[PDB]
Amino acid sequence: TELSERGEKLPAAQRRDMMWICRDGDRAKNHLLEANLRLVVSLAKRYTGRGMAFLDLIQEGNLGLIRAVEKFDYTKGYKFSTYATWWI
DNA sequence: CGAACCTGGTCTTGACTCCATTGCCGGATTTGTATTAGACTGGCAGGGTTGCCCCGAAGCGGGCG
């Protein structure tokens, strides 16, 4: 995005693997969200029975899981559920 | 016989009062958003009941290419 405007006609290999990494990041993000959907379901099974329906609670948990996978850090050496339970 | 008078109003001038009406201003309360790092990973859940009728769809016996 920086080198698109006012930038450079990059080499073909550099632009091609730049697009490869740009696709791989979104593939990994979709893979991580689809991995932890089950954790969202297992947490949201207990807030039912009052007011809201079950599937709306599942969807709001999914949105919180989106925020948790956006703000998750790996260098703190903790597991992902430890951080994601707060946001969910 | 005229004449004051006395009193309906008709109206104005000037001072006074008084309360809306914004306008800041300082603070109070109200409302919205962001962030919490050990690990946690696929629901509880509640019932099955009539009678009659119409009609549309699934499936099976039965011949056929």
Curated annotation (Swiss-Prot):
Motif (Interaction with polymerase core subunit RpoC): 56-59
Covalent S-S links between cysteines: none
UniProt region (Sigma-70 factor domain-2), positions on chain: 32-88
Localization, UniProt: Cytoplasm
Oligomeric and partner information: Interacts transiently with the RNA polymerase catalytic core formed by RpoA, RpoB, RpoC and RpoZ (2 alpha, 1 beta, 1 beta' and 1 omega subunit) to form the RNA polymerase holoenzyme that can initiate transcription.
Free-text note on domains in this protein's UniProt record: The sigma-70 factor domain-2 mediates sequence-specific interaction with the -10 element in promoter DNA, and plays an important role in melting the double-stranded DNA and the formation of the transcription bubble. The sigma-70 factor domain-2 mediates interaction with the RNA polymerase subunits RpoB and RpoC.
Family per similarity comment: Belongs to the sigma-70 factor family. RpoD/SigA subfamily.
Function: Sigma factors are initiation factors that promote the attachment of RNA polymerase to specific initiation sites and are then released. This sigma factor is the primary sigma factor during exponential growth.
Protein name per UniProt: RNA polymerase sigma factor SigA
